[PDB]
């Protein structure tokens, strides 16, 4: 099932205290009005493995504290490095063993680093960047049970922790005797309006729609009546014709490299090659040669 | 423990022990004559003791003498193009000193590897441990032997009698990542108390710069550290010692 990520998803990109400043930042955000895959916890059903990405938005409506955990692995089968995050009754546990995960990994009602600590939105934004794993959080209360609420709540950075993996797959851990949403971030540019205190109260996607591009250009939320030039149109080349001349005769490098009588340094040969289809790439794709340092042209591109 | 390590890893699979949230003391560390090469690129080595970094990186491995000059920004070569690749904007620096003291015992050391030719050039900071086989254009493979399916991992023949350029140089490269983030690691400089409402030269968490420091009525959020201006100049900081 699909639904609308109306405005949720903006998190303080860094450690700053701008006051009443419209600050433009380019980073991984959940694009506005995006489709988020909406998973159920009712009746049979299950919590399938979900593809990770450059970033993942995890918003869950919770009424009975069912959801407790997340999985972040490449194989999820003890072959490869695997992070876990779980929250049992009062303790938050994070472990990164090469765990042997169940095919149905559920919490019923070479090891390395560890640390220990519908009415509710426990919005989370799990992003992995430059060998660092960041988690963002928020706990807005709501009364709309059907779907996501329109509104704007910024996400404070909960915790940062250094694993450094290819995390490419994702799954959550539900207490088994509570729907949760998933969205994938993108490298968009956002204009964030810091309030007096610094609570982000509104933001605009620079690429959502033609109106929104102007707001970024004017660097204002309200734009006055008129015409504004924003971006430049370009027609992308579709094909790329590789047209070269039509002559078929391989250049005689072979005899130079397979020569028998190399000439002395003072009287060196000056074999001239032209009007032929040289093939430098396969020529030097051999490990005999000791020095290949090229000055005027990068060696790979010669072909 | 990094420099006093007992088992240096092979170059094809180098260790990457990480160091953070501690008081590094570089100046005394290189104030020894043992190290043979100390070329520092992003930072003048003397000032290392003074800076504050977000995080550092200890990568160590073993290579022969001729390759130590290769480990460097903007360099090409066998190990350079196949084992350890430094980005051009490398901020940090390398360490070198021989280990004929500790390696090539007397009969041919064979515990250190090479990772010779591989299909494509190695991207910066990638330990590659995949040595299944090489292909060399001509197809016949998985019959792993002998012709144009050449095993990528050579071994160093390390000898006590091996010249001066073939000897084992144990190296370790430090790469500093310097960002506008709470600096975990810093030099060993004690601190004075705080003087307020006065034109004082100030250094906070290694931020640096002067100004007149006064109490602020503005309410930071708990995580935030560095106040900033509309013109993107530092105007407020949080006192590290007392919040």
């Amino acid at each position: 099932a699909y639904t609308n990520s109306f405005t949720r998803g903006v998190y303080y990109p860094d450690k700053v205290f701008r006051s009443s400043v419209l600050h433009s930042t380019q980073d991984l955000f959940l694009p506005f009005f995006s489709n988020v895959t909406w998973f159920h916890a009712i009746h049979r059903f299950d919590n399938p493995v979900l593809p990770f990405n450059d970033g993942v938005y995890f918003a869950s409506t919770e009424k009975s504290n069912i959801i407790r955990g997340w999985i972040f692995g490449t194989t999820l089968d003890s072959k490869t490095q695997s992070l876990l995050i779980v929250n049992n009754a009062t303790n938050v546990v994070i472990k990164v063993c090469e765990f042997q995960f169940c095919n149905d990994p559920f919490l019923g009602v070479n090891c390395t680093f560890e640390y220990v600590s519908f009415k509710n939105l426990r919005e989370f934004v799990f992003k992995n960047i430059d060998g660092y794993f960041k988690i963002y959080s928020k706990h807005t209360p709501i009364n709309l049970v059907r779907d996501l609420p329109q509104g704007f709540s910024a996400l404070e950075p909960l915790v940062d922790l250094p694993i450094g993996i290819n995390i490419t797959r994702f799954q959550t851990l539900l207490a088994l005797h509570a729907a949760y949403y998933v969205g994938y971030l993108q490298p968009r540019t956002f204009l964030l309006k810091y309030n007096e205190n610094g609570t982000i109260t509104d933001a605009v996607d620079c690429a959502l729609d033609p109106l929104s591009e102007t707001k970024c250009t004017l660097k204002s939320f309200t734009v006055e009546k008129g015409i504004y030039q924003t971006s430049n149109f370009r027609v992308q080349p579709t094909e790329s014709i590789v047209r070269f001349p039509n002559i078929t005769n391989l250049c005689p490098f072979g005899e130079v490299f397979n020569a028998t009588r190399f000439a002395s340094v003072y009287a060196w040969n000056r074999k001239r090659i032209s009007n032929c289809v040289a093939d430098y790439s396969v020529l030097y794709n051999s490990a005999s040669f000791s020095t290949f340092k090229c000055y005027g042209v990068s060696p790979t591109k010669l072909n | 423990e990094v420099f006093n390590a007992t088992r240096f890893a092979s170059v094809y699979a180098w260790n990457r022990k990480r160091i953070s949230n501690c008081v590094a003391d570089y100046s005394v560390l290189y104030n020894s004559a043992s190290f043979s090469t100390f070329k520092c690129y992003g930072v003048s080595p003397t000032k290392l003791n003074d800076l504050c970094f977000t995080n550092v990186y200890a990568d160590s491995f073993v290579i022969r003498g001729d390759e130590v000059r290769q480990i460097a920004p903007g360099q090409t070569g066998k190990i350079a193009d196949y084992n350890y690749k430094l980005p051009d904007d490398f901020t940090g620096c390398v360490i070198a000193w021989n280990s004929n003291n500790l390696d090539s015992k007397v009969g041919g050391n064979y515990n250190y590897l090479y990772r010779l030719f591989r299909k494509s050039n190695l991207k910066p900071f990638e330990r590659d441990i995949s040595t299944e086989i090489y292909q060399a254009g001509s197809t016949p493979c998985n019959g792993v032997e002998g012709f144009n399916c050449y095993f990528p991992l050579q071994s160093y023949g390390f000898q006590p009698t091996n010249g001066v350029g073939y000897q084992p140089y144990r190296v370790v490269v430090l790469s500093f990542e310097l960002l506008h983030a709470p600096a975990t690691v810093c030099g060993p400089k004690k601190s004075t108390n705080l003087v307020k409402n006065k034109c004082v030269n100030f250094n906070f968490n290694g931020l640096t710069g002067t100004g007149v420091l006064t109490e602020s009525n503005k309410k930071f959020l708990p995580f935030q550290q560095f106040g900033r201006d509309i013109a993107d100049t530092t105007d407020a900081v949080r006192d590290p010692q007392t919040l």
Epitope: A287, S288 | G107, G108, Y110, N111, L113, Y114, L116, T131, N142, G143, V144, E145, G146, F147, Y150, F151, L153, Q154, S155, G157
Partner: antibody
């Protein structure tokens, strides 16, 4: 670097025998292992080839089906099971290390060998 | 397949003699021959690889050359400990074969 060959001796015809090639001094898990026999009075004869992991094993036509060479990189030891021994199988056997000379030219060559064990198939 | 041919199959010579042994390959391998010396009752010793390159610790009187199908191992001056059986070993492809073995003795 030491390579230990053992397991030869007097064996009746038509029987079986397992030979041992013990590896020490180098990362044995990274090199193919070969058995080569030299029968008394005549020269060297290539017998078997295995992969560094044992996943790929090949033999000469003179021994196919009869011989089964095995590899255990966990303990880094080489073995050869010869079944249905006969008088033509009476030979000294060498297990020889694979690999290339110290660095580049091209060729993969027979470096450090074993010491030799005779397997005399006699009644 | 690849066949290795040596000539002569055996010979004898005195100390100081220049000995030449030829190994001819079935087809053009040109880069893969390996000369090994075996003293009787002991393990063979690698001498030459790539049919023209010398292995360390081997006296310089040993020398190799050749390419394509014709290969040669030479010793400028035979020595009292040289006298043994020499096998040329191509490494071009599986299954690698040997020659028939050439025993050089005293006269």
């Amino acid at each position: 670097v030491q390579l230990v060959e053992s397991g030869g001796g007097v064996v009746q015809p038509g029987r079986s025998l397992r030979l041992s090639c013990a590896a020490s001094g180098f990362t044995f898990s990274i090199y193919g292992m070969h058995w080569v026999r030299q029968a008394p009075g005549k020269g060297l004869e290539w017998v078997a080839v295995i992969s560094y992991d044992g996943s790929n094993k090949y033999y000469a036509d003179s021994v196919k089906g009869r011989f089964t060479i095995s590899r255990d990189n966990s303990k880094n030891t080489l073995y050869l099971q010869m079944n249905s021994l006969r008088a033509e199988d009476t030979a000294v056997y060498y297990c020889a290390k694979e690999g290339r000379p110290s660095d580049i030219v091209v060729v993969v060559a027979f470096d450090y060998w074993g010491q030799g064990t005779l397997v005399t198939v006699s009644s | 397949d690849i066949q290795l041919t040596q000539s002569p199959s055996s010979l004898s010579a005195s100390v100081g003699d220049r000995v030449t042994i030829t190994c001819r390959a079935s087809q053009s391998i040109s880069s893969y021959l390996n000369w090994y010396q075996q003293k009787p009752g002991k393990a063979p010793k690698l001498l030459i690889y790539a049919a023209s390159s010398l292995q360390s610790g081997v006296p310089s009187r040993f020398s190799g050359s050749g390419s394509g199908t014709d290969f040669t191992l030479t010793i400028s001056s035979l020595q009292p400990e040289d006298f043994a059986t020499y096998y040329c070993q191509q490494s071009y492809s599986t299954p690698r074969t040997f020659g028939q073995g050439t025993k050089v003795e005293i006269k």
